[PDB]
Each structure stands twice: as C-alpha cells, then as structure tokens.
Amino acid sequence: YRVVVLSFELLHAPATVCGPKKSTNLVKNKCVNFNFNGLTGTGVLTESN
Amino acid sequence: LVRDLPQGFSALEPLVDLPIGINITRFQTLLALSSSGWTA
C-alpha cells in the first residue's frame, strides 16, 4: 500500500491554510442577509454612486 | 525642491501584510555600487 499521512502543525502561528469558501449569486432591492467576506448583516443592497 | 526634508502633507497606502512571527530587533539596508572607485 502507498500510504500518505496528512499531519499538521497548529496553534503556533496565524492560521494560513484551510478549505475553500462558498459563493452565491447576489440580488438587489430586496431585504436579504449578506455575509460579505467578513460582514454579516441584513438589508437592501442597491448600487452605488 | 533640492535637499530639505520637505514640509507638506501626504499619506501612505498599504502595500502588504505577512504572517511571519519572528524575533526582530534590528535592520540594515543594502546599496548598489566598485570598491576603489564607482559612479553614482
């Protein structure tokens, strides 16, 4: 058997490697619940000037 | 202006952050240069 062991070192540095992140389609003019990259809030997402 | 450390206001946009976490106390620069003669 070819054996690969994925061990890890943690808790001694700012974490740098981990899994991917989900992505969904946006929408406008409707009270939704956004989670923009760090910002979890609720409201209407119009466009900007 | 020519030589004086100028008076006037500006800002400093960020370049980069890095996760390093090392013991740091000192720094030296590097200069481009021959030894017994050069042009700069």
Side-chain angles (χ1 to χ4, degrees), chain B:
Chain B
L1 202 56
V2 288
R3 179 258 159 272
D4 191 15
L5 185 43
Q7 188 274 327
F9 207 72
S10 177
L12 286 177
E13 293 92 354
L15 277 296
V16 65
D17 64 342
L18 292 172
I20 298 300
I22 58 179
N23 184 15
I24 55 174
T25 190
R26 197 197 315 281
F27 69 100
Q28 284 76 245
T29 179
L30 310 169
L31 183 63
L33 188 63
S34 86
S35 185
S36 295
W38 63 94
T39 49

mmCIF file of all heavy atoms in Angstrom, chain B:
data_model
loop_
_atom_site.group_PDB
_atom_site.id
_atom_site.type_symbol
_atom_site.label_atom_id
_atom_site.label_comp_id
_atom_site.label_asym_id
_atom_site.label_seq_id
_atom_site.Cartn_x
_atom_site.Cartn_y
_atom_site.Cartn_z
ATOM 1 N N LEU B 1 11.872 70.546 -4.998
ATOM 2 C CA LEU B 1 12.851 71.065 -4.056
ATOM 3 C C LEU B 1 14.131 70.231 -4.126
ATOM 4 O O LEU B 1 14.188 69.177 -4.764
ATOM 5 C CB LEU B 1 12.276 71.075 -2.639
ATOM 6 C CG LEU B 1 12.914 72.026 -1.623
ATOM 7 C CD1 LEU B 1 12.876 73.453 -2.136
ATOM 8 C CD2 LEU B 1 12.221 71.923 -0.276
ATOM 9 N N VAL B 2 15.170 70.711 -3.447
ATOM 10 C CA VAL B 2 16.511 70.183 -3.669
ATOM 11 C C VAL B 2 16.940 69.196 -2.587
ATOM 12 O O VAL B 2 17.156 68.014 -2.875
ATOM 13 C CB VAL B 2 17.521 71.338 -3.820
ATOM 14 C CG1 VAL B 2 17.308 72.036 -5.151
ATOM 15 C CG2 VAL B 2 17.359 72.359 -2.701
ATOM 16 N N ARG B 3 17.066 69.650 -1.340
ATOM 17 C CA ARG B 3 17.666 68.793 -0.326
ATOM 18 C C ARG B 3 16.837 68.689 0.949
ATOM 19 O O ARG B 3 16.827 67.636 1.598
ATOM 20 C CB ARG B 3 19.078 69.294 0.005
ATOM 21 C CG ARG B 3 19.797 68.487 1.076
ATOM 22 C CD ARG B 3 19.766 69.208 2.417
ATOM 23 N NE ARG B 3 19.976 68.300 3.540
ATOM 24 C CZ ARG B 3 18.995 67.644 4.151
ATOM 25 N NH1 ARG B 3 17.745 67.796 3.751
ATOM 26 N NH2 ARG B 3 19.259 66.836 5.164
ATOM 27 N N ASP B 4 16.135 69.757 1.315
ATOM 28 C CA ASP B 4 15.484 69.801 2.617
ATOM 29 C C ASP B 4 14.371 68.762 2.707
ATOM 30 O O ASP B 4 13.654 68.514 1.734
ATOM 31 C CB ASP B 4 14.921 71.196 2.880
ATOM 32 C CG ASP B 4 14.476 71.377 4.313
ATOM 33 O OD1 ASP B 4 14.856 70.540 5.161
ATOM 34 O OD2 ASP B 4 13.745 72.350 4.595
ATOM 35 N N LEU B 5 14.237 68.151 3.876
ATOM 36 C CA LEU B 5 13.150 67.206 4.109
ATOM 37 C C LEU B 5 11.837 67.966 4.014
ATOM 38 O O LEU B 5 11.510 68.727 4.933
ATOM 39 C CB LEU B 5 13.301 66.541 5.475
ATOM 40 C CG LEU B 5 12.313 65.437 5.852
ATOM 41 C CD1 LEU B 5 12.086 64.494 4.692
ATOM 42 C CD2 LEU B 5 12.817 64.670 7.059
ATOM 43 N N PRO B 6 11.058 67.792 2.949
ATOM 44 C CA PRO B 6 10.044 68.793 2.608
ATOM 45 C C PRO B 6 8.927 68.872 3.635
ATOM 46 O O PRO B 6 8.569 67.882 4.275
ATOM 47 C CB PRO B 6 9.522 68.312 1.252
ATOM 48 C CG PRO B 6 9.738 66.845 1.278
ATOM 49 C CD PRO B 6 10.994 66.615 2.068
ATOM 50 N N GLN B 7 8.391 70.077 3.792
ATOM 51 C CA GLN B 7 7.164 70.273 4.545
ATOM 52 C C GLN B 7 5.971 70.165 3.607
ATOM 53 O O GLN B 7 5.999 70.666 2.481
ATOM 54 C CB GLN B 7 7.174 71.633 5.243
ATOM 55 C CG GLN B 7 6.023 71.849 6.210
ATOM 56 C CD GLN B 7 4.782 72.387 5.525
ATOM 57 O OE1 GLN B 7 4.873 73.147 4.562
ATOM 58 N NE2 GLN B 7 3.615 71.986 6.013
ATOM 59 N N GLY B 8 4.924 69.515 4.079
ATOM 60 C CA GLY B 8 3.747 69.241 3.276
ATOM 61 C C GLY B 8 3.193 67.876 3.627
ATOM 62 O O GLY B 8 3.905 66.973 4.066
ATOM 63 N N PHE B 9 1.891 67.719 3.424
ATOM 64 C CA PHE B 9 1.186 66.536 3.883
ATOM 65 C C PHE B 9 0.904 65.573 2.740
ATOM 66 O O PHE B 9 0.650 65.978 1.603
ATOM 67 C CB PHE B 9 -0.127 66.907 4.570
ATOM 68 C CG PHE B 9 -0.570 65.897 5.576
ATOM 69 C CD1 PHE B 9 0.100 65.762 6.775
ATOM 70 C CD2 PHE B 9 -1.637 65.065 5.314
ATOM 71 C CE1 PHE B 9 -0.296 64.825 7.700
ATOM 72 C CE2 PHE B 9 -2.038 64.128 6.237
ATOM 73 C CZ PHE B 9 -1.366 64.008 7.431
ATOM 74 N N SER B 10 0.952 64.288 3.068
ATOM 75 C CA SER B 10 0.649 63.208 2.143
ATOM 76 C C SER B 10 0.077 62.056 2.965
ATOM 77 O O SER B 10 -0.329 62.245 4.115
ATOM 78 C CB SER B 10 1.900 62.818 1.338
ATOM 79 O OG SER B 10 1.638 61.719 0.484
ATOM 80 N N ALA B 11 0.036 60.865 2.379
ATOM 81 C CA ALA B 11 -0.469 59.693 3.077
ATOM 82 C C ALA B 11 0.418 58.509 2.718
ATOM 83 O O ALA B 11 1.486 58.670 2.122
ATOM 84 C CB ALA B 11 -1.941 59.451 2.725
ATOM 85 N N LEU B 12 -0.027 57.307 3.081
ATOM 86 C CA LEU B 12 0.742 56.095 2.805
ATOM 87 C C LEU B 12 -0.247 54.948 2.615
ATOM 88 O O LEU B 12 -0.712 54.365 3.597
ATOM 89 C CB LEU B 12 1.720 55.799 3.934
ATOM 90 C CG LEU B 12 2.979 56.652 4.069
ATOM 91 C CD1 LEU B 12 3.766 56.237 5.295
ATOM 92 C CD2 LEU B 12 3.835 56.523 2.837
ATOM 93 N N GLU B 13 -0.554 54.628 1.363
ATOM 94 C CA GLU B 13 -1.410 53.488 1.093
ATOM 95 C C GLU B 13 -0.684 52.193 1.447
ATOM 96 O O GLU B 13 0.541 52.108 1.332
ATOM 97 C CB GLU B 13 -1.830 53.461 -0.372
ATOM 98 C CG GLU B 13 -2.741 54.601 -0.789
ATOM 99 C CD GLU B 13 -1.979 55.792 -1.326
ATOM 100 O OE1 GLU B 13 -0.732 55.775 -1.264
ATOM 101 O OE2 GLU B 13 -2.623 56.744 -1.815
ATOM 102 N N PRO B 14 -1.411 51.171 1.883
ATOM 103 C CA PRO B 14 -0.756 49.922 2.277
ATOM 104 C C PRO B 14 -0.182 49.178 1.086
ATOM 105 O O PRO B 14 -0.716 49.224 -0.024
ATOM 106 C CB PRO B 14 -1.885 49.119 2.935
ATOM 107 C CG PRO B 14 -2.974 50.107 3.193
ATOM 108 C CD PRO B 14 -2.861 51.111 2.103
ATOM 109 N N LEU B 15 0.932 48.488 1.331
ATOM 110 C CA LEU B 15 1.490 47.549 0.366
ATOM 111 C C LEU B 15 1.157 46.105 0.715
ATOM 112 O O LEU B 15 0.508 45.418 -0.077
ATOM 113 C CB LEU B 15 3.009 47.721 0.232
ATOM 114 C CG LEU B 15 3.517 48.812 -0.710
ATOM 115 C CD1 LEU B 15 3.096 48.468 -2.125
ATOM 116 C CD2 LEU B 15 3.011 50.188 -0.336
ATOM 117 N N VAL B 16 1.565 45.631 1.894
ATOM 118 C CA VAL B 16 1.347 44.208 2.154
ATOM 119 C C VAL B 16 1.489 43.834 3.623
ATOM 120 O O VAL B 16 2.292 44.420 4.356
ATOM 121 C CB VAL B 16 2.305 43.356 1.297
ATOM 122 C CG1 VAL B 16 3.747 43.596 1.704
ATOM 123 C CG2 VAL B 16 1.947 41.878 1.371
ATOM 124 N N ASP B 17 0.721 42.836 4.055
ATOM 125 C CA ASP B 17 0.910 42.196 5.346
ATOM 126 C C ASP B 17 1.372 40.762 5.131
ATOM 127 O O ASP B 17 1.095 40.150 4.096
ATOM 128 C CB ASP B 17 -0.371 42.208 6.186
ATOM 129 C CG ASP B 17 -1.488 41.394 5.564
ATOM 130 O OD1 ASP B 17 -1.420 41.093 4.355
ATOM 131 O OD2 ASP B 17 -2.432 41.040 6.297
ATOM 132 N N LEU B 18 2.092 40.235 6.112
ATOM 133 C CA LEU B 18 2.659 38.902 6.014
ATOM 134 C C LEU B 18 2.607 38.219 7.370
ATOM 135 O O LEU B 18 2.987 38.815 8.385
ATOM 136 C CB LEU B 18 4.113 38.951 5.522
ATOM 137 C CG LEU B 18 4.307 39.400 4.077
ATOM 138 C CD1 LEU B 18 5.779 39.608 3.772
ATOM 139 C CD2 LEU B 18 3.696 38.377 3.136
ATOM 140 N N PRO B 19 2.137 36.972 7.419
ATOM 141 C CA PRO B 19 2.216 36.190 8.659
ATOM 142 C C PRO B 19 3.617 35.616 8.805
ATOM 143 O O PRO B 19 3.999 34.697 8.079
ATOM 144 C CB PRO B 19 1.172 35.085 8.450
ATOM 145 C CG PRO B 19 0.374 35.512 7.234
ATOM 146 C CD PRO B 19 1.338 36.281 6.398
ATOM 147 N N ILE B 20 4.391 36.169 9.734
ATOM 148 C CA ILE B 20 5.773 35.738 9.895
ATOM 149 C C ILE B 20 6.017 35.266 11.322
ATOM 150 O O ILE B 20 6.345 34.096 11.551
ATOM 151 C CB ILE B 20 6.744 36.865 9.510
ATOM 152 C CG1 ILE B 20 6.571 37.229 8.035
ATOM 153 C CG2 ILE B 20 8.165 36.436 9.757
ATOM 154 C CD1 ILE B 20 6.844 36.082 7.089
ATOM 155 N N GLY B 21 5.847 36.164 12.290
ATOM 156 C CA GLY B 21 6.039 35.814 13.684
ATOM 157 C C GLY B 21 7.453 35.399 14.041
ATOM 158 O O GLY B 21 7.692 34.231 14.360
ATOM 159 N N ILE B 22 8.401 36.332 13.981
ATOM 160 C CA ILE B 22 9.793 36.044 14.306
ATOM 161 C C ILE B 22 10.338 37.119 15.235
ATOM 162 O O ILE B 22 9.844 38.251 15.269
ATOM 163 C CB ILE B 22 10.670 35.936 13.040
ATOM 164 C CG1 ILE B 22 10.598 37.230 12.229
ATOM 165 C CG2 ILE B 22 10.253 34.743 12.201
ATOM 166 C CD1 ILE B 22 11.448 37.213 10.976
ATOM 167 N N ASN B 23 11.372 36.754 15.990
ATOM 168 C CA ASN B 23 12.059 37.691 16.870
ATOM 169 C C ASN B 23 12.839 38.695 16.029
ATOM 170 O O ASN B 23 13.763 38.320 15.299
ATOM 171 C CB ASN B 23 12.992 36.942 17.821
ATOM 172 C CG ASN B 23 13.672 37.858 18.822
ATOM 173 O OD1 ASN B 23 13.272 39.007 19.003
ATOM 174 N ND2 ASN B 23 14.711 37.350 19.475
ATOM 175 N N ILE B 24 12.472 39.969 16.137
ATOM 176 C CA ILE B 24 13.046 41.037 15.330
ATOM 177 C C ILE B 24 13.564 42.135 16.248
ATOM 178 O O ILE B 24 12.877 42.547 17.190
ATOM 179 C CB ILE B 24 12.010 41.586 14.325
ATOM 180 C CG1 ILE B 24 10.741 42.030 15.051
ATOM 181 C CG2 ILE B 24 11.673 40.543 13.279
ATOM 182 C CD1 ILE B 24 9.745 42.716 14.159
ATOM 183 N N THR B 25 14.795 42.583 15.998
ATOM 184 C CA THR B 25 15.350 43.699 16.762
ATOM 185 C C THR B 25 16.125 44.718 15.942
ATOM 186 O O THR B 25 16.428 45.791 16.476
ATOM 187 C CB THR B 25 16.266 43.187 17.876
ATOM 188 O OG1 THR B 25 16.601 44.272 18.748
ATOM 189 C CG2 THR B 25 17.546 42.633 17.287
ATOM 190 N N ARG B 26 16.480 44.445 14.690
ATOM 191 C CA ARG B 26 17.450 45.287 14.006
ATOM 192 C C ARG B 26 17.256 45.149 12.504
ATOM 193 O O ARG B 26 16.690 44.163 12.025
ATOM 194 C CB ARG B 26 18.876 44.905 14.420
ATOM 195 C CG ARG B 26 19.941 45.934 14.103
ATOM 196 C CD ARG B 26 21.328 45.317 14.166
ATOM 197 N NE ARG B 26 21.503 44.468 15.338
ATOM 198 C CZ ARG B 26 21.753 44.927 16.559
ATOM 199 N NH1 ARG B 26 21.870 46.231 16.765
ATOM 200 N NH2 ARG B 26 21.897 44.084 17.571
ATOM 201 N N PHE B 27 17.733 46.148 11.763
ATOM 202 C CA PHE B 27 17.645 46.093 10.312
ATOM 203 C C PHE B 27 18.762 46.919 9.693
ATOM 204 O O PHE B 27 19.136 47.974 10.210
ATOM 205 C CB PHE B 27 16.290 46.598 9.805
ATOM 206 C CG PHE B 27 16.073 48.064 9.995
ATOM 207 C CD1 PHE B 27 16.255 48.940 8.938
ATOM 208 C CD2 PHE B 27 15.655 48.566 11.209
ATOM 209 C CE1 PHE B 27 16.046 50.290 9.096
ATOM 210 C CE2 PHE B 27 15.444 49.917 11.375
ATOM 211 C CZ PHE B 27 15.639 50.782 10.316
ATOM 212 N N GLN B 28 19.287 46.426 8.571
ATOM 213 C CA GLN B 28 20.287 47.131 7.784
ATOM 214 C C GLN B 28 19.861 47.151 6.326
ATOM 215 O O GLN B 28 19.330 46.163 5.812
ATOM 216 C CB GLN B 28 21.671 46.485 7.899
ATOM 217 C CG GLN B 28 22.383 46.770 9.201
ATOM 218 C CD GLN B 28 21.833 45.961 10.349
ATOM 219 O OE1 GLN B 28 21.265 46.511 11.287
ATOM 220 N NE2 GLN B 28 22.005 44.648 10.285
ATOM 221 N N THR B 29 20.093 48.279 5.666
ATOM 222 C CA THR B 29 19.749 48.413 4.263
ATOM 223 C C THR B 29 20.873 47.885 3.376
ATOM 224 O O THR B 29 21.944 47.493 3.846
ATOM 225 C CB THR B 29 19.444 49.867 3.924
ATOM 226 O OG1 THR B 29 19.141 49.968 2.529
ATOM 227 C CG2 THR B 29 20.637 50.740 4.239
ATOM 228 N N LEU B 30 20.621 47.878 2.069
ATOM 229 C CA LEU B 30 21.609 47.496 1.072
ATOM 230 C C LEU B 30 21.668 48.545 -0.026
ATOM 231 O O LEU B 30 20.650 49.122 -0.418
ATOM 232 C CB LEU B 30 21.304 46.129 0.457
ATOM 233 C CG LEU B 30 21.029 45.020 1.460
ATOM 234 C CD1 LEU B 30 20.492 43.784 0.772
ATOM 235 C CD2 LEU B 30 22.321 44.709 2.184
ATOM 236 N N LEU B 31 22.870 48.756 -0.543
ATOM 237 C CA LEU B 31 23.124 49.804 -1.515
ATOM 238 C C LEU B 31 23.795 49.204 -2.739
ATOM 239 O O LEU B 31 24.646 48.318 -2.618
ATOM 240 C CB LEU B 31 24.009 50.893 -0.909
ATOM 241 C CG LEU B 31 24.313 52.102 -1.784
ATOM 242 C CD1 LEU B 31 23.024 52.819 -2.096
ATOM 243 C CD2 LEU B 31 25.285 53.029 -1.081
ATOM 244 N N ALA B 32 23.407 49.685 -3.916
ATOM 245 C CA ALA B 32 24.045 49.269 -5.156
ATOM 246 C C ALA B 32 25.321 50.075 -5.368
ATOM 247 O O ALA B 32 25.359 51.279 -5.105
ATOM 248 C CB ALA B 32 23.101 49.443 -6.345
ATOM 249 N N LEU B 33 26.366 49.402 -5.837
ATOM 250 C CA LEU B 33 27.651 50.063 -6.024
ATOM 251 C C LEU B 33 28.353 49.570 -7.285
ATOM 252 O O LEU B 33 29.127 48.612 -7.246
ATOM 253 C CB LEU B 33 28.544 49.841 -4.800
ATOM 254 C CG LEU B 33 29.853 50.630 -4.791
ATOM 255 C CD1 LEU B 33 29.540 52.113 -4.764
ATOM 256 C CD2 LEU B 33 30.722 50.248 -3.606
ATOM 257 N N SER B 34 32.297 49.824 -8.053
ATOM 258 C CA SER B 34 33.336 49.002 -7.445
ATOM 259 C C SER B 34 33.758 49.565 -6.092
ATOM 260 O O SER B 34 33.208 50.561 -5.626
ATOM 261 C CB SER B 34 34.547 48.896 -8.372
ATOM 262 O OG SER B 34 35.431 49.987 -8.180
ATOM 263 N N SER B 35 34.744 48.920 -5.466
ATOM 264 C CA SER B 35 35.181 49.327 -4.134
ATOM 265 C C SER B 35 36.040 50.587 -4.189
ATOM 266 O O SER B 35 35.690 51.616 -3.601
ATOM 267 C CB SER B 35 35.944 48.184 -3.462
ATOM 268 O OG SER B 35 36.275 48.508 -2.124
ATOM 269 N N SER B 36 37.165 50.524 -4.891
ATOM 270 C CA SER B 36 38.074 51.664 -5.020
ATOM 271 C C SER B 36 37.723 52.512 -6.235
ATOM 272 O O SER B 36 38.564 52.793 -7.089
ATOM 273 C CB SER B 36 39.517 51.182 -5.089
ATOM 274 O OG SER B 36 39.906 50.557 -3.878
ATOM 275 N N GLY B 37 36.464 52.930 -6.321
ATOM 276 C CA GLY B 37 36.004 53.726 -7.440
ATOM 277 C C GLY B 37 34.649 53.277 -7.942
ATOM 278 O O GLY B 37 34.385 52.075 -8.036
ATOM 279 N N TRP B 38 33.787 54.232 -8.270
ATOM 280 C CA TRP B 38 32.432 53.943 -8.726
ATOM 281 C C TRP B 38 31.840 55.232 -9.284
ATOM 282 O O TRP B 38 32.454 56.302 -9.216
ATOM 283 C CB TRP B 38 31.570 53.381 -7.595
ATOM 284 C CG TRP B 38 31.383 54.343 -6.467
ATOM 285 C CD1 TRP B 38 30.348 55.214 -6.301
ATOM 286 C CD2 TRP B 38 32.258 54.541 -5.351
ATOM 287 N NE1 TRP B 38 30.522 55.938 -5.148
ATOM 288 C CE2 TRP B 38 31.689 55.545 -4.547
ATOM 289 C CE3 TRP B 38 33.468 53.965 -4.953
ATOM 290 C CZ2 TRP B 38 32.286 55.987 -3.370
ATOM 291 C CZ3 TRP B 38 34.060 54.405 -3.784
ATOM 292 C CH2 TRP B 38 33.469 55.406 -3.006
ATOM 293 N N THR B 39 30.637 55.118 -9.841
ATOM 294 C CA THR B 39 29.878 56.268 -10.314
ATOM 295 C C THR B 39 28.443 56.133 -9.836
ATOM 296 O O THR B 39 27.807 55.098 -10.059
ATOM 297 C CB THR B 39 29.921 56.379 -11.842
ATOM 298 O OG1 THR B 39 29.602 55.110 -12.426
ATOM 299 C CG2 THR B 39 31.300 56.820 -12.304
ATOM 300 N N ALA B 40 27.935 57.176 -9.182
ATOM 301 C CA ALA B 40 26.590 57.138 -8.633
ATOM 302 C C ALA B 40 26.059 58.556 -8.486
ATOM 303 O O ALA B 40 26.816 59.530 -8.499
ATOM 304 C CB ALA B 40 26.556 56.414 -7.282
#
